[PDB]
Every structure is written in structure tokens, then in C-alpha cells.
Design a protein around this ligand. Structure first.
Ligand code: ATP
Ligand code: CA
Ligand code: CA
Ligand code: CA
Ligand code: CA
Ligand code: CA
Lengths: 365, 347
């Protein structure tokens, strides 16, 4: 014909879905399943779901659940229909005709991967499939086999040292602080100013404000002082129903949380500390290359200035002569997906598919 | 399995591959040292160890102009090669003009950089992009059907409905003299295009005489006086009833038969059966649909596809006729419109 592979990258906030050999995922949609809201006592056994962007469009009459929590699938029923919607609606293909590459969170439990595989073969009838670690794909995308990745999405942030192709699992670092939190914090911070951002509708406007006018301050407390001297650093923003709101130091106080998780009351080390701590859990002999290959991934690493911050912060934490590089690829919202598109297109990857037949002969594996 | 992996590296020496469109291709042997700056390469060095086994070094080289797929592939090939050598090889990332001394010492004359190289393997996409500008006449007495017409005011009349589809924005427009059934269909199909064809990533704008928005006028130009129109006759209705034919491609009975299931609209949804493929020929409008049942076998699928596209020339349909292929459950509105009471499976 001849057959094309599907690459599908399931994340807590967004599904990135498309065909192997593309630049980019063809379809990019909210990782949500929505049912029509009901109020009070219960009577019946129900009915229909809506998935993804149609759920966004229809939210005013429905309640939205998220199948993936902190990068792990926890709701299999709803994860099934997130995949159904990907196959039949967004890519609009017969899954039975295409090998399919899927991504997983680092340290994803064996049982998760096995269910994922079960569903693909037994409910979706794919001819073959493969599961790739999210972070590892991102590293490949930048053309490295050794480095340490910071992947930070809507629901989870990870630090994954990788050497000579494969992640070092004991040095992997998971922080349950990502986009949604940052978004929630900006909602909070702006409300304390005197606006009204509470409702889940408003959570969408703030996500936009967050991703359009936030940045990471090179030096936090200096920027605080600049913000208290002039209006210089202030931006204006227009709400649909509105009307214009003014935004100030919240521009940088919001992403700051990544470096100071106490902003939202978290005991945790900051992303710079978790990076350093991750490098330090690795063989001393490979640390040098880890420091010179800090690759950034995920929508939450998109903040202007974040690279220069990682640089300043890591420099400070590391040995004085250590060569430190931060790689922040322009297209890093989709690094994981691009990694998959490249791996799935390789002549040599054909050998690596778990085929349907091979499945029907062992306990997933 | 893979043939290049088999060749590598079985004895002392130097091997060099260039990444080409997702593949590892060996470099012409007296060209070792010539390196295209638009390209990416993998280099294996094999040294004989006095104890009987060999030392491997894998260097993947990346030109300043190489595309992301090539550098990505170069990297991945390196790990797959190292794995095939039981992880016993040492990986080196070599950036153009910054090559390792050990790497440089593989070439007695020194590297020679070369402008150009082989075209990237990537097809290019911009996520969620849709480029569409098309217009529909929604018309009928009791059997309303949507049919495509030129994108101009000349297609318009005050007696029918029209869907002007611009991608993220869909203009549903009904004339004042449009009957009740045409209005529901306009709405049905508009919502279909938005929620189904555009995955919800589109907005529908409803309009009529004197309310039509800037963006509608922006395409169609300044609204002239629109004609008519004649009411829908029961005779015109029976025409809509014959607009499309429905075939079944199957070999379930031992041999490949393309049977005509129905030539009269609306078809029974029940007719589309999972063990087979089906073709909904609406070729006059430039649209043939190939419905693949989830249990149809692979030969049935290739036949349906072939048959469907024979129709274009056999029936002298106006190419550019579009053959869309639909998975069971992935059906589109302009194909769902020909069915009596479509029932959405999971609801
Ligand atoms: N320019 C930007 N600035 C800040 N944040 C952004 C920007 N663009 C996208 N984001 C955030 O990135 C997140 C989505 O990124 P991504 O798709 O990598 O996460 P995910 O894979 O869905 O979730 P996870 O990786 O946590 O499971 C959203 O929270 C979004 O607000
Ligand atoms: Ca993710
Ligand atoms: Ca090239
Ligand atoms: Ca090795
Ligand atoms: Ca009419
Ligand atoms: Ca059959």
C-alpha cells in the first residue's frame, strides 16, 4: 500500500497524535472525557461521553474527567475512549492497519504498560505496537544518546539522566508540579489582586494568560524590585467578555514556583535542585556529559528565560569548572512526539514491533 | 536483519554510513572523509585486541545543516548498533567543526566538508491546521441532501440553505423561503462538520438575509440581489432519493464480488456490516466513500479502494473526485447524510 505507523503521545493535559515521518503531530487535543452534568440524588444506571476538543466546546453542559494523572493512566474506561477518539476521529484511520507507537511516563509500572498493550491488541486490534519512554524520545529528538532531560508538562515534571541510549532508573526524579498547578497558582495570585478567576471556564483564560505573558526571571528578587519601581514590566490582556486586565509581577511569580515549590506549599526541592540531585545519583564518570547536555522538554519548559535560569542555577550548584549547557529546542512542546516519529520511521525499527501474533503467545512482555 | 548491521564490524577497520531518509546507507569506500554538511553519518571503528576480541567505537557525526530527522536517526542508529554489539561499544557525538581528536585521527588527510546533501525524510505538518474553503447547497422537500457548489454568490438562492465551510468557522445560512426540513438538515450537517470533521476545533455561525458577517462577505464579495426560489417538488425529492448508490465489496462467499446493495436513499445504517467493506458512490458530486468494516479482511480493503477509484473514470466523474476512506465508526457527515436516523454507537 504501503502501511504507515501511528505515533501517539498521551499526556496528562494533551494528546499529541499523528503519523510517523511527520515534522509534528497532526492532531493536538485536551486529554479529557466529559459527560453531561447532573445535580443531586441519583436515579438511573448514564449514556454518552464527549472527548477532547468537543468536550472543551461543550463544557458548559458537562463535567470533565482526566484519564491520565501525573503522567500515569489511572482511568482505563476513559483512557479507552481517549484512544478511540484518536483513532476514529482525530487521525481518522483503521487502527487494525497501522503499527502504533505509544509513549509512557518514566518509571511507569509494569502493569500499566501491560494493560496498555492488552487494550491495543485486544480492543483495538492493531497489527503491531511499541512503547517508548517519553523522556528518552525527547533526547533522541535533539540528536543525543547521552544527556539529562527535564520533561515538564501539564501534570508532571521529571528528571531523567540517560546514558548511551537508556535511562538510569534509580536517578530518575519525579515532581508532581507542572502546568495545571502553575495555572492554578496564577488564578490564585490574580484573584488576590482583585480579579475573579475561580470557575473552570476562567481556568482556560488563565492558561492563555499564563502561556502568553509569563516568563522566568533571571533573578527573582531583583525583578520584584523593578516591579515595585515602575509600570515598566506590566502587560495588558483582553478577556472575551471584557475588558482589559493589568498583569504585573505575577508574570514571573507564577513560573517561579518551578524553582520554589513552597509558593504553593510544597515541601519539594526546585527543578534546578532536582536536576542537580539527579546528576549526583549517577556514576561520577558520566556526570560531565550530563551537565553539558541538559535537554528541556514539555510545554511547561516553554517559559522565556527558563534556559538562562537553569544555567545560572545549575552553575551555582555544580563544581566551579564544570561545563554546563542547557538545550531548549524551539519545538519542545512536541519533542516526545518528534522522537517517536523518527524512531518509528527507521528501517531498523520494523524488527522491534511487538506483533499481534507474538502477543497471542505470551503474558504481554 | 538488518543487512548493514550484519556487515558491522566483523574485523579491524573503519566503516562509515550516511543516514538517508530513515536508513543507514554505506558511504562509497574511497569517499571516507568527505562529509556533507546537510547530512548525518554513523562511524564505527574496530580495533583488534591482543586477547582475541575487538574494541568498538561508535561516532555519529552531524552537519551544521542536517535536518532533525537525520540527526535524530543518526543518534538512534548508534544505540541500536551498540546494542547489537552487546553494549560493548563507546558512543561519541561529533558536531561539525568540533570533532573529537580521536575522531579526526581516523582520517589521514583530514576531513573535507561538502555543501549540500540528501533531502530530509520528514513530511512537514503544522498541528491542527486545516485549509478549507467550500460551499454547500442544502436542499430538499422532505428528503434534504447536501451537495457541493462553487464558492460564489451565484450558487445562492433565497429558497434553500447553504453551508459555507471555512475550516475553523462554518457559516450556516438559510434563505427566508427555505422550508422546515432544509433548516434542520443545515443544522445537522453544520454541527456534524464542526464536531466530527473538525474534532470540535471549529465554530458555527448561523446567518440569514441581512445578518451575514464580515468574514462571509470577505469571501463571497458584496451581496447582490439573490433569486427565487422555486419550492421543492415531490419529484425533486425523488431525485435526491436516487443521488447515490451503495455497493458491498466482499469475498465471504469464496470470491470477490462487488454487489449493488441499494440505489435508493436514505440507506439503512444496518446495511453497513463489519465483516465487509462498502462503497457509497456519490461520484456526481465528486465524492466516493470507502467504508471499511473492522472485521473485513485485507483483500476486501484493497479491492474496495481499487473499485472505488475505477468508478471515477468508468463513470466519467469529474476529477478532482475525492475518494475518502472511512473506518467503521469514523464516518463523516457528508456520508452520514445519506442514512435514515444515524445512531452514534457509544451514546
Ligand atoms: N508558552 C507556554 N508557556 C508556559 N506553559 C505552556 C506554554 N505552552 C504550553 N504550556 C503548558 O504546557 C502544558 C502542556 O504540555 P505537554 O503537552 O508537554 O504536557 P502533557 O504531556 O500533556 O502532560 P504531562 O507531560 O505532565 O503528563 C500545559 O500545561 C500548558 O499550559
Ligand atoms: Ca507528557
Ligand atoms: Ca540532509
Ligand atoms: Ca555501550
Ligand atoms: Ca428550498
Ligand atoms: Ca468479509
Amino acid at each position: 500500500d504501503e502501511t504507515t505507523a501511528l505515533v501517539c503521545d498521551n499526556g496528562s493535559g494533551l494528546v499529541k497524535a499523528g503519523f510517523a515521518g511527520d515534522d509534528a503531530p497532526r492532531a493536538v487535543f485536551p486529554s479529557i472525557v466529559g459527560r453531561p452534568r447532573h445535580q443531586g440524588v441519583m436515579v438511573g444506571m448514564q449514556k454518552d461521553s464527549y472527548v477532547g476538543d468537543e468536550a472543551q466546546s461543550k463544557r458548559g453542559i458537562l463535567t470533565l474527567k482526566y484519564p491520565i494523572e501525573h503522567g500515569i493512566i489511572t482511568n482505563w474506561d476513559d483512557m479507552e475512549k481517549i484512544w478511540h477518539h484518536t483513532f476514529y476521529n482525530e487521525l481518522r484511520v483503521a487502527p487494525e492497519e497501522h503499527p502504533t507507537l505509544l509513549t509512557e511516563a518514566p518509571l511507569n509500572p509494569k502493569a500499566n504498560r501491560e494493560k496498555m498493550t492488552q487494550i491495543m491488541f485486544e480492543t483495538f486490534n492493531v497489527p503491531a505496537m511499541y512503547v517508548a519512554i517519553q523522556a528518552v524520545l525527547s533526547l533522541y529528538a535533539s540528536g543525543r544518546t547521552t544527556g539529562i532531560v527535564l520533561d515538564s508538562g501539564d501534570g508532571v515534571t521529571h528528571n531523567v539522566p540517560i546514558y548511551e541510549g537508556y535511562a538510569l532508573p534509580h536517578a530518575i526524579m519525579r515532581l508532581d508540579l507542572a502546568g495545571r498547578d502553575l495555572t492554578d497558582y496564577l488564578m490564585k495570585i490574580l484573584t488576590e489582586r482583585g480579579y475573579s478567576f475561580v470557575t473552570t471556564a476562567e481556568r482556560e483564560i488563565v492558561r492563555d494568560i499564563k502561556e502568553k505573558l509569563c516568563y522566568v526571571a533571571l533573578d527573582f528578587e531583583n525583578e520584584m524590585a523593578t516591579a515595585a519601581s515602575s509600570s515598566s514590566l506590566e502587560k495588558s490582556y483582553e478577556l472575551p467578555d471584557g475588558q482589559v486586565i493589568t498583569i504585573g509581577n505575577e508574570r514571573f511569580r507564577c513560573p517561579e514556583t518551578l524553582f520554589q515549590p513552597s509558593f504553593i506549599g510544597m515541601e519539594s526541592a526546585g527543578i534546578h535542585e532536582t536536576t542537580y540531585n539527579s546528576i549526583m545519583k549517577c556514576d561520577i564518570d558520566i556526570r560531565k556529559d550530563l551537565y553539558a547536555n541538559n535537554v528541556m522538554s514539555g510545554g511547561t519548559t516553554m517559559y522565556p528565560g527558563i534556559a538562562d535560569r537553569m544555567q545560572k542555577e545549575i552553575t551555582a550548584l555544580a563544581p566551579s569548572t564544570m561545563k554546563i549547557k542547557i538545550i531548549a529546542p524551539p519545538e519542545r512542546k512536541y519533542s516526545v512526539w518528534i522522537g517517536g516519529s523518527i524512531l518509528a520511521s527507521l528501517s531498523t525499527f520494523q524488527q522491534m514491533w511487538i506483533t499481534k501474533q507474538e502477543y497471542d503467545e505470551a503474558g504481554p512482555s | 536483519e538488518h543487512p548493514e548491521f550484519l556487515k558491522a564490524g566483523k574485523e579491524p577497520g573503519l566503516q562509515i554510513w550516511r543516514v538517508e531518509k530513515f536508513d543507514l546507507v554505506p558511504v562509497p569506500t574511497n569517499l571516507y572523509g568527505d562529509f556533507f554538511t546537510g547530512d548525518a553519518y554513523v562511524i564505527l571503528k574496530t580495533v583488534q585486541l591482543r586477547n582475541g576480541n575487538l574494541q568498538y567505537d561508535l561516532h555519529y557525526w552531524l552537519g551544521n545543516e542536517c535536518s532533525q530527522d537525520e540527526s535524530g536517526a543518526a543518534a538512534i542508529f548508534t544505540v541500536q548498533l551498540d546494542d547489537y554489539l552487546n553494549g560493548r561499544a563507546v558512543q561519541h557525538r561529533e558536531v561539525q567543526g568540533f570533532e573529537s581528536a580521536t575522531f579526526l585521527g581516523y582520517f589521514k588527510s583530514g576531513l573535507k566538508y561538502k555543501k549540500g546533501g540528501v533531502a530530509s525524510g520528514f513530511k512537514h505538518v503544522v498541528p491542527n491546521e486545516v485549509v478549507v474553503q467550500r460551499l454547500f447547497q442544502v436542499k430538499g422537500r422532505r428528503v434534504v441532501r447536501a451537495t457541493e457548489v462553487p464558492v460564489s454568490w451565484e450558487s445562492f438562492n433565497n429558497g434553500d440553505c447553504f453551508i459555507l465551510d471555512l475550516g475553523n468557522n462554518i457559516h450556516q445560512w438559510c434563505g427566508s423561503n427555505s422550508n422546515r426540513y432544509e433548516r434542520l438538515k443545515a443544522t445537522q450537517v453544520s454541527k456534524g462538520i464542526r464536531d466530527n470533521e473538525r474534532s470540535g476545533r471549529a465554530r458555527v455561525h448561523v446567518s440569514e438575509e441581512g445578518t451575514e458577517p464580515e468574514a462571509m462577505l470577505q469571501v463571497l464579495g458584496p451581496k447582490p440581489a439573490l433569486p427565487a426560489g422555486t419550492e421543492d417538488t415531490a419529484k425533486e425529492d425523488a431525485a435526491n432519493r436516487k443521488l447515490a448508490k451503495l455497493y458491498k465489496v466482499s469475498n465471504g462467499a469464496g470470491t470477490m464480488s462487488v454487489s449493488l446493495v441499494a440505489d435508493e436513499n436514505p440507506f439503512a445504517q444496518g446495511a453497513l456490516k463489519s465483516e465487509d467493506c462498502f462503497i457509497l458512490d456519490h461520484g456526481k458530486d465528486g465524492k466516493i466513500f470507502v467504508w471499511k468494516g473492522k472485521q473485513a479482511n485485507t483483500e476486501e480493503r484493497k479491492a474496495a479502494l481499487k473499485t472505488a477509484s475505477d468508478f471515477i473514470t468508468k463513470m466519467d466523474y469529474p476529477k478532482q473526485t475525492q475518494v475518502s476512506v472511512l473506518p467503521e465508526g469514523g464516518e463523516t457527515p457528508l456520508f452520514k447524510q445519506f442514512f435514515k436516523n444515524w445512531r452514534d454507537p457509544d451514546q
